[PDB]
């Protein structure tokens, strides 16, 4: 839990975007991870401080599938701590995860959605998603961004669901390496 209390406070920040509120998790440096959809453009507010986009890279596999990630660079001198040790190299589930949210709307939430599972594609909304895990939680509106974490392991951002399940999207560290 010390690991997941100190994730909330050093790295998952409110976010809004144009298209409402989303939960943010600083990665290290200035670089940062939004759902896809939340689609930050040139700017972003957080913790109502409007920053400037720099960069916002869309992450998709070796076939150019959705993987509903977007990287992004903010403008600002402040660093995250760098948490890149804690999130897997291969895409992993986990047996107690704790889905973190942080909006202006949902603030400092931990979620226990149980267990996290390899689910593979998703069909998000029309869009073909892959790398994506599933937990059978009734994950809500509002929710996405969300950090999806187990024993000191950052493993999933929160991009989807159903009504009765969650899915989010699997994270490897090597997405985030310099270059
Ligand atoms: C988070 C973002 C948000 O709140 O958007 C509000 C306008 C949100 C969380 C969930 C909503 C329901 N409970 C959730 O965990 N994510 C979304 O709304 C995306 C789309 C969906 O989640 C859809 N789910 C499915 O398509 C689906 C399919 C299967 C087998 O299981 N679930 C529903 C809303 C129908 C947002 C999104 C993502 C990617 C896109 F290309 C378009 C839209
Ligand atoms: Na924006």
Known sequence: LDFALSLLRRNIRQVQTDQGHFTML????????????????KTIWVEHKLINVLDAVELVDEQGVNLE???????????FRDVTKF?????????????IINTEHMPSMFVPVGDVVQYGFLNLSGKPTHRTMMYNFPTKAGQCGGVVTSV????????????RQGFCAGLKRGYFASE
């Open 26 to 41: 600083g990665v290290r440096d200035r670089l940062a991870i939004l759902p896809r959809h939340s689609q930050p453009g």
């Open 152 to 163: 000191g392991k950052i493993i999933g951002i929160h991009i989807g669901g159903n009504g």
């Open 69 to 79: 990630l977007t990287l992004v660079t903010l403008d600002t001198n402040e660093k």
């Open 87 to 99: 999130i897997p190299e291969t895409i992993t589930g986990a047996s107690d995860a704790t889905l």
